[PDB]
Structure formats: structure tokens, C-alpha cells
Amino acid sequence: AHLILHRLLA
Amino acid sequence: TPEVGELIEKVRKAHQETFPALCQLGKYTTNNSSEQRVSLDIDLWDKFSELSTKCIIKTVEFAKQLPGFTTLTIADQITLLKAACLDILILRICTRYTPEQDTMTFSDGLTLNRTQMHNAGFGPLTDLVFAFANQLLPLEMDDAETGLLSAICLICGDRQDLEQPDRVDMLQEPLLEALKVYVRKRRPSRPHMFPKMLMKITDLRSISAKGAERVITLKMEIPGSMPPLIQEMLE
Ligand SMILES: CC1(C)CCC(C)(C)c2cc(C(=O)Nc3ccc(C(=O)O)cc3)ccc21
């Protein structure tokens, strides 16, 4: 899901 | 499409604002397995994995400040960050190499010698990583050059599973042009500097391929699990 990455990017 | 001078300053600032230089830091050392080689020193591994998590957060902050990076699809921003993770982390730790003591310094000041970097998790990658640090040193690169090299490494259209690789190739072209004019303007007496810097990207990709093999063996060796952000980047 790349949950943390999604958070950092969005 | 910005002018070369503007692109260089943007990238230089993106790198400087996410990377403290060795001179700015308060170096400190630890006695943990400083003179004994071991398969994995768990206290060093715990410290190293925590600092790596922090460096990943700074790498994402750097990427978001690169012109056009946030215009790519979110899937491609993730594919690019995952693929360049080890390349940028390795370039960053190698930038803080002190040759006399053969040490590398992390972003909080922690300074580890070659045996301690080996024990912390580098293992079989140790000599290749230190060899790269030694090759980087005579280049006397500045923040603009290191930032542009990191940006060229990240914005690469040959990574597997990109949705829009031609768009990524187009975004990389101005970065390569900017590094070329900057390197020549900064040091006109050294006409072989630009190809020597480009060769470091190739050396770095070879080390990062070996790094992905080391993540596999470390996963079998660590007592617990990899930190969540490291797992997102490398698994
Ligand atoms: C492949 C291997 C051994 C296992 C997986 C992890 C732990 C992700 C890793 C991390 C690095 C690395 O270079 N981490 C850095 C940590 C902090 C700074 C800083 O503070 O500047 C810079 C780099 C190298 C190799 C590996």
C-alpha cells in the first residue's frame, strides 16, 4: 500500500 | 523549462536544506564493537536503522523540491523513490567520509569506523561503499553537484514499472544539462570533471544492486522486523 510514503507525498 | 541557473539553485537548495554537512555536525563516537568484526552488532543495527529511517524522510523531502517531480503520477513518484533509495542514502553517507580515521558520519553526528559500519549492517557491502567514498573525495563536489547527482539518480526513466518513463526521461534532461554547465563554470581548469561525476552514478547503481541482496540476508539476521518506512522503500 505504501501508506507512509503516500502520506509524505500527498 | 527554467533557466539553467534557476534549476541549479533550486536543486542546490533542496539538497542543502535536507542534508547537514560534515563541518556543521558535532561528531561523536561509540565503543560498541569498534575493534572486533562481528556478523551483526544489534546496538549498532538499531541506531543505524533509526538513522536510515530519518534519511529516507529527508530524501522524500528533497525529491518533493525537485522541479516537476511532484507533477509525475503518485505511482511513478513511489517507483522512482523506491528504486533510488539506496543510491541516495549511500551517496549521502559517503559524502561524510573522513579518510585519516576511515570513518563515515551520520546526520546526528554519529561517526563510525569501517569495522563499526560493517557490524551495523553493511557486511559484505563495506569495502565497496568505502571504495566509493574514496573515489568521491578527490572530486571536491559542492552542494549543487551532490544535489544534481542525487536528482539525476532519482529521476531516471529506465526504472522498471514506470507508467510514464518518457516523461521521466524528459524531466531528467534539464538536470543533466545543468550539471554540465555548472561543473564547467565552477572549475574550467578541469575538463574531465563532468564525465567523472557521471561515472559515479554507474558505480552507485552497482553498489545499490548489491545492497538489495544485503537487505535479504539482513532480514534473516535481525532479531525483529525492519522499520515500516524501510520496508516500504525496499520490499
Ligand atoms: C543495504 C543496507 C545495508 C540495509 C538497509 C538500510 C538499513 C536501509 C541501509 C542503509 C544505508 C544507508 O546508507 N543509510 C544511511 C543512514 C543515514 C544517513 C545519514 O544520516 O546521512 C545516510 C545513509 C546503506 C545500506 C543499507
Side-chain angles (χ1 to χ4, degrees), chain A residues 1-2 4-10, chain B residues 1-2 4-5 7-99 101-134 136-204 206-235:
Chain A
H2 304 120
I4 303 164
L5 277 183
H6 274 100
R7 258 62 106 222
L8 297 169
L9 289 168
Chain B
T1 193
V4 178
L7 182 60
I8 290 163
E9 177 63 24
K10 185 79 171 75
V11 176
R12 182 208 63 84
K13 185 183 181 286
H15 176 76
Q16 181 192 239
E17 295 183 350
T18 59
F19 182 76
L22 178 55
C23 63
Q24 297 180 289
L25 296 171
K27 295 169 71 191
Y28 71 95
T29 64
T30 176
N31 289 327
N32 301 75
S33 67
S34 65
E35 308 211 8
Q36 50 155 12
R37 290 283 164 104
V38 293
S39 191
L40 190 73
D41 179 309
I42 200 48
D43 296 317
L44 290 175
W45 161 257
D46 288 341
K47 179 63 177 173
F48 173 57
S49 59
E50 168 259 307
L51 286 164
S52 296
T53 294
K54 292 185 167 60
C55 188
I56 295 173
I57 293 167
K58 295 290 185 201
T59 294
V60 173
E61 283 304 310
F62 166 74
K64 294 167 57 180
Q65 303 180 249
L66 297 176
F69 181 84
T70 58
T71 74
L72 300 174
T73 68
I74 295 296
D76 282 356
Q77 294 174 42
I78 295 171
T79 294
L80 291 179
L81 282 161
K82 290 171 58 58
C85 184
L86 296 180
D87 289 343
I88 295 171
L89 263 51
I90 292 170
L91 175 57
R92 283 175 169 230
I93 193 59
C94 290
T95 297
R96 302 208 203 87
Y97 177 66
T98 301
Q101 282 89 49
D102 195 39
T103 62
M104 297 201 189
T105 295
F106 294 82
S107 294
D108 76 335
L110 175 67
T111 298
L112 302 188
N113 68 23
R114 191 182 296 239
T115 295
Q116 287 173 310
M117 292 285 277
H118 171 277
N119 300 350
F122 281 93
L125 307 174
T126 311
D127 291 339
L128 297 170
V129 169
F130 278 72
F132 184 81
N134 272 291
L136 216 54
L137 203 69
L139 267 39
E140 291 166 336
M141 278 165 70
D142 69 3
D143 282 288
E145 297 161 344
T146 305
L148 281 160
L149 216 59
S150 301
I152 295 165
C153 185
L154 174 65
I155 300 170
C156 172
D158 69 24
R159 307 301 201 173
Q160 300 164 271
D161 298 317
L162 286 169
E163 295 173 341
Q164 313 179 307
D166 292 343
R167 187 152 174 227
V168 177
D169 282 336
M170 288 294 199
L171 203 57
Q172 189 192 43
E173 299 176 330
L175 294 169
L176 282 159
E177 307 161 11
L179 183 64
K180 191 166 62 172
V181 343
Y182 186 78
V183 165
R184 276 65 210 72
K185 182 188 179 189
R186 197 204 158 207
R187 292 194 260 95
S189 80
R190 301 176 140 276
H192 296 168
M193 186 58 51
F194 182 64
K196 282 185 173 204
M197 287 182 188
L198 298 173
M199 273 298 113
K200 303 293 170 297
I201 304 173
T202 305
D203 305 338
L204 205 47
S206 174
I207 302 168
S208 66
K210 289 286 179 184
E213 306 169 23
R214 176 63 170 140
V215 167
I216 293 161
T217 68
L218 270 169
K219 279 178 67 181
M220 309 171 176
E221 179 152 27
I222 62 168
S225 61
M226 286 282 182
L229 183 59
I230 294 173
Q231 285 195 75
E232 292 197 16
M233 306 308 305
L234 301 182
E235 272 116 269

